[PDB]
């Protein structure tokens, strides 16, 4: 029901500002402390500013690394909450995330400021800070960013102005956070070779309009483990014939902006538990007394929103009850399995 | 396929010095009349991944001479001297002989501050414990005589997500087998039960000063999971299909399952027949562990739709495409 979503972030100059947005529902934001956090990339959190509550006075407090720079404000009427970030340095880049504060106050010892804590935290915005212009080699631009449902399909462009670049082999990359770059599959220039990789030749599509110089990339059956940035890449390499012509891969030369994607995951015969509304549920079998090969599946979130999941052992050919028990939502579901036509 | 190897896995170093990354890989990288397909990019964080250095040695065009590369044979080296400020980010070697033509692991370059570099909450960043194994995590500083503190999991490119706070307060949905603890000037979380996906950072929150308005983040710890094998024997499945059962047909949904019981490899390729066709979003799938009874893994293939769709056509199929079994071992249904 919390939700909580950055924005605002891009990139500027050293030394010129920037405003942050936190749009937060699902809670009473008025009397709710909120607090803004960071983490430079590859490093650790660091806390940055909080603001109080109501009856608290609205006084905020900074950090130190942040004081007199930065300002935190609040709307209580658009249940949004800023973040004014003036003078910055090389040193704030990283990802800015704003989160549900908490006032943890152990009742009956009683002590004088407590501790603060984070309940609800968003996915987080990015800050960047470098001056550059990004615009100078702009000569490969690819498609918007865009969002679908786990399931759909999704095409990625990518072009270059009018008939610009070919010599040079089309070359797809995708990039994982954390995971690290990863080759995905090319497009010699000659055409004779679309090499995809066998870890991604079951779902993706690559595809060479040469009419008009413009590279697909067809993204079938999404899964949330792909949600990452598409680059494009055109580069040299280096053919030599043998029997069957042979190729080396010299360079990625000139990139693309990167199509960032995300799928939203949150915008011998057995028994089935089918449409149950809180995780988890338990399955024994025969009354807790069979357990040779049972292979209780774990749960998944279908379409409906409720999990499901299945629950089977495997039974010898001579012999030709699993109590299901959901206890949050006060359901006995006791069921014996029997064919029939 | 053969990989890299990228190493060291990060650094942090001060600006005006000087670094040095090496890329190993399997077997070799040069052909004939002495070449060396091998390239390195930086990505600078946000910006698309810059070109650097390709084919061994050869400096691309723009890029500062501070930038040179090295190496031969399958291990490489590049330098980077009078290191400034936006040389940050991953840095990755890149092979061009061997396809399919793979990356390696990356290298995030941090610039030392040596400026109030002096964390509140002190917390070790290297743990590491095996596979259904206990381990705990601590966290130092001078406000825990008179604090607690609260303890998150962060998984790259999310959200954190926080795990214990205060004496012992467990929020919902988070699994029970972390719990947090304290004593003196230090405070700890433990997991008592090992699992894959607890492997992430972790970090502890807490007062800097002892009566003070701040909050400060620890160090960070990477916690590591160390799981083995049992038996890594190719094994095939056992392929069963179950069609939708009547009670079922007396509702508006009808779901299709298909099974894969005890085998190795983990791979195995699935693909349905809603009617000698793909499908296009309406499968989904669930596995379990290895049973500690046979090592092996499991299958468990949903195929749902809506009962005035499963009526529809007479022959679904279940294709299994394994590495111990050969042949796709179809399964197929009828009404009769």
């Known amino acids: 029901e919390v939700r909580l979503v950055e924005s605002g972030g891009g990139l500027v100059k050293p030394g010129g500002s920037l405003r942050l947005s936190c749009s937060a529902s699902?809670?009473?934001?008025?009397?709710?402390?909120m607090t803004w956090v960071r983490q430079p990339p590859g490093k650790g959190l660091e806390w940055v500013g909080r603001?109080?509550?109501?009856?608290?006075?609205?006084?905020?407090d900074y950090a130190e690394s942040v004081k007199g720079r930065f300002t935190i404000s609040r709307d209580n009427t658009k249940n949004t909450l800023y973040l004014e970030m003036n003078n910055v340095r090389t040193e704030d880049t990283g990802y800015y995330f704003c989160?549900?504060?908490?006032?943890?106050?152990?009742?009956?010892?009683?002590?004088?400021?407590?501790?603060?804590?984070?309940?609800?935290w968003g996915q987080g915005t990015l800050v960047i800070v470098s001056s550059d212009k990004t615009h100078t080699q702009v000569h490969l631009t690819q498609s918007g960013p865009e969002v679908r449902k786990p399931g759909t399909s999704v095409k990625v462009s990518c072009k270059a102005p009018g008939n610009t670049l070919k010599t040079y082999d089309l070359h797809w990359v995708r990039s994982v956070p954390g995971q690290g770059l990863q080759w995905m599959g090319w497009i010699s220039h000659e055409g004779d070779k679309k090499v995809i990789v066998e870890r991604f030749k079951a779902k993706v599509t690559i595809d060479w309009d040469r009419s008009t110089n413009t590279a697909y990339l067809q993204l079938s059956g999404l899964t949330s483990g792909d949600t990452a940035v598409y680059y494009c890449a055109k580069g040299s390499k280096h053919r030599l014939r043998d029997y069957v012509d042979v190729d080396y891969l010299s360079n990625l030369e000139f990139w693309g902006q990167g199509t960032a994607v995300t799928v939203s995951s949150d915008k011998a015969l057995g028994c089935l538990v089918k449409d149950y509304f809180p995780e988890p549920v338990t399955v024994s079998w025969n009354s807790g007394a069979l357990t040779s090969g049972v292979h209780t599946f774990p749960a998944v979130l279908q379409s409906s929103g409720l999990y499901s999941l299945s629950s089977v052992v495997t039974v010898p050919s001579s012999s030709l009850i699993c109590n299901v028990n959901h206890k949050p939502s006060n359901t006995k579901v006791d069921k014996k399995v029997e064919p029939k036509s | 396929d053969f990989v890299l190897t990228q190493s060291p896995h990060s650094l942090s170093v001060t600006p005006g010095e000087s670094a040095s990354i090496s890329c190993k890989s399997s077997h070799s990288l040069i052909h004939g009349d002495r070449n060396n397909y091998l390239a390195w990019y930086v990505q600078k964080p946000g910006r698309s991944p810059q070109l650097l250095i390709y084919l061994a040695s050869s400096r691309a065009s723009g890029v500062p001479d501070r930038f040179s590369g090295s190496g031969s044979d399958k291990d490489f080296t590049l330098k980077i001297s009078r290191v400034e400020t936006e040389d940050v980010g991953t840095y990755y070697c890149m092979q061009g002989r061997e396809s399919p033509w793979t990356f390696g692991q990356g290298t995030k370059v941090d610039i030392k501050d040596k400026t109030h570099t002096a964390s509140e909450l002190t917390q070790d960043p290297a743990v590491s414990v095996a596979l259904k194994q206990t381990v705990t995590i601590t966290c130092r500083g001078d406000?825990?005589?008179?604090?607690?503190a609260s303890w998150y999991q962060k998984k790259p490119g999310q959200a954190p997500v926080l795990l214990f706070y205060?004496?012992?307060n467990r929020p919902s949905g988070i699994p029970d087998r972390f719990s947090g603890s304290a004593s003196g000037n230090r405070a700890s979380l433990t997991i008592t039960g090992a699992q894959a996906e607890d492997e992430a950072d972790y970090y502890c929150?807490?007062?800097?000063?002892?009566?003070?308005?701040?909050?400060?983040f620890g160090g960070g710890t990477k916690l590591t999971v160390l799981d083995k094998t049992h038996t890594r024997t190719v094994a095939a499945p056992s392929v069963f299909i179950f069609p939708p059962s009547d009670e079922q047909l007396k509702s508006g949904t009808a779901s299709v399952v298909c099974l894969l019981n005890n085998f190795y490899p983990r791979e195995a390729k699935v693909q349905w027949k809603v009617d000698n066709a793909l499908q296009s979003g309406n499968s989904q799938e669930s596995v379990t562990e290895q049973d500690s009874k046979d090592s092996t893994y499991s299958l468990s293939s949903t195929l749902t739709l809506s009962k005035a769709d499963y009526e529809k056509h007479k022959v679904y199929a279940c294709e299994v495409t394994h590495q111990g079994l050969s042949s796709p071992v179809t399964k197929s249904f009828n009404r009769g």
């Open positions: 989160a549900r504060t908490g006032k943890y106050y152990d009742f009956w010892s009683g002590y004088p400021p407590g501790e603060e804590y984070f309940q609800d």
């Open positions: 699902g809670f009473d934001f008025d009397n709710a402390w």
């Open positions: 603001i109080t509550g109501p009856g608290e006075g609205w006084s905020v």
């Open positions: 406000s825990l005589r008179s604090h607690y």
């Open positions: 205060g004496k012992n």
């Open positions: 929150s807490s007062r800097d000063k002892s009566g003070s308005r701040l909050s400060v």
